[PDB]
Amino acid sequence: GLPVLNTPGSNQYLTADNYQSPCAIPEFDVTPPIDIPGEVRNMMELAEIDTMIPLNLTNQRKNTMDMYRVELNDAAHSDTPILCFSLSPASDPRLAHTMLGEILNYYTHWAGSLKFTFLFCGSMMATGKLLVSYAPPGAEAPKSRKEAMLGTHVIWDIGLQSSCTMVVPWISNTTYRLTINDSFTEGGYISMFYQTRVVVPLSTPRKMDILGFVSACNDFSVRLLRDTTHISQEA
């Protein structure tokens, strides 16, 4: 017969192989498909959908609805940050549980910019100005508005727009970032401060909540599919 050679790797099972296999049900009548609404062809298409961020993970607000809201008041202007977190979507607890974080948890490497949106849920009479800043990697995390205003930032003018979106530029020293906690691929920090204050008239609520959302940009991509760290099974 035709000479053959049993090259290395034969008689082995690989979970990511692609070989033709015999059909267990020959000549089966396959049901024709139908146009089911909501066709998805790439997982990244889901990463571009806004997901509410569980920003407040305090011991009292954890694992309830309150963790999805950030509180604001009409107190005098202060440089103390309103909100702070790190650009580690696959490692930060506040972002790892979002759709972006969940998808990233299935992959080892990722790249691309992100959109962070904030929605104001106060009254119409309420108005104010807020600052949202992104500190690039390699610098001490901002501790006051004075350090926050040294980098990319956006102004949320509550009174003209009820929502504000900020785009995080792809400032990195590597082509791709890792989905684990490591100082090699730090993504920087994102902080939110007051600009002047929240102003409300008489007979108006003085405690108003804002909602945060995170989504992927058009350039977002992932690679090196891997198992997630938020899954377990008995035995």
Partner: protein, 233 residues
Amino acid sequence: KRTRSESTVESFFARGACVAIIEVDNDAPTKRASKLFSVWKITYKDTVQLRRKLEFFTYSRFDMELTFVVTSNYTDANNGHALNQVYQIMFIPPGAPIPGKWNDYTWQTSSNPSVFYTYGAPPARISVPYVGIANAYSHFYDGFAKVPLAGQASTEGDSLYGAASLNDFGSLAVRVVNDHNPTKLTSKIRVYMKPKHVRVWCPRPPRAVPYYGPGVDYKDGLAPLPEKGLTTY
């Protein structure tokens, strides 16, 4: 007489070399002294041949072939013979679960690449492309993962020279999927690395002293040059 066909980068690097040996045991779980499964961090610095070959250049790009040569033996000769052994080798990329028990959920291989081997078959071989986050693999890193900053506590901001950012390339978990044999069996899998499509940049001088750790540190054996007369042929 020149030819220069065997002196090319491909010819120089396209050779199989053993980088690690993973040891596993098939025994009763109740014996805490036995290791039912093993985990090995992927790296070429555990050996000296391929490490020395690779350190000839500062930067490199290449695809890789992994070969798993499996051997096994008995710990006794008074218990007849055991059944054929089947081995599972699972790849754990960064951030993926690390198996904790021999039969925990992490072995479901829902999304982790896995290779199943039957004893006696030709050694399993797999191919992987370039998976470096950067544009080229780096064998040396003159820097730190974390840079301490003024005002930081002395217990924070510290990192080892060079650390590891581009070197986090996952691990391999090896286990036996067959039932625990009544008689203890010891198995060893040799991992052979074979690079292909090798491109190199920034040549470096060959190592002169024995390798001590993944870095460039040395402690002894710093006298490689022998004695020879100045005017002696």
